Design a protein around this nucleic acid. Sequence first.
DNA 1: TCAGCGCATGG
DNA 2: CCATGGCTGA
Length: 142
Amino acid sequence: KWTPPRSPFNLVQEILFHDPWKLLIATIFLNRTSGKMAIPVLWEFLEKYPSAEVARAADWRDVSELLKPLGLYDLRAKTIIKFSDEYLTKQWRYPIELHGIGKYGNDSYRIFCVNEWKQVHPEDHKLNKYHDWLWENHEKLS
DNA sequence: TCAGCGCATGG
DNA sequence: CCATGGCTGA
Ligand code: NI
């Protein structure tokens, strides 16, 4: 079992690893959006949308106005509905193949949800900080 | 390759 | 004020 450690950077992925869907939802929330804005909205979403089954069948207009202050409301809204639907339906392995999930959300999955972390090469800053911090203190862990 | 989605905040 | 905080469809 992998179970990624918590860093000083405190990425939201650090507490979302045990729920691949929730982590992947967080990545979507972080597209062209600061963590300061996105993260609190993520929680208000998660309380009203705890599962991929709940988000699968849902009113995409009803998530949209919740994503309003962030921007990209109906874009993400219809995207999440499909992704959550695509989540519980298809067979995947690596998450990229799911709609709305590109390289970033995949690198997050590969690092946090499984142990590829040594192999994975990050793009995003936050991920790269965590990844570089890993190679340093990993011997002090396991 | 690339427009396009989108509001908030910092420079 | 005009930058900047991923991904798809095409
Ligand atoms: Ni995808």
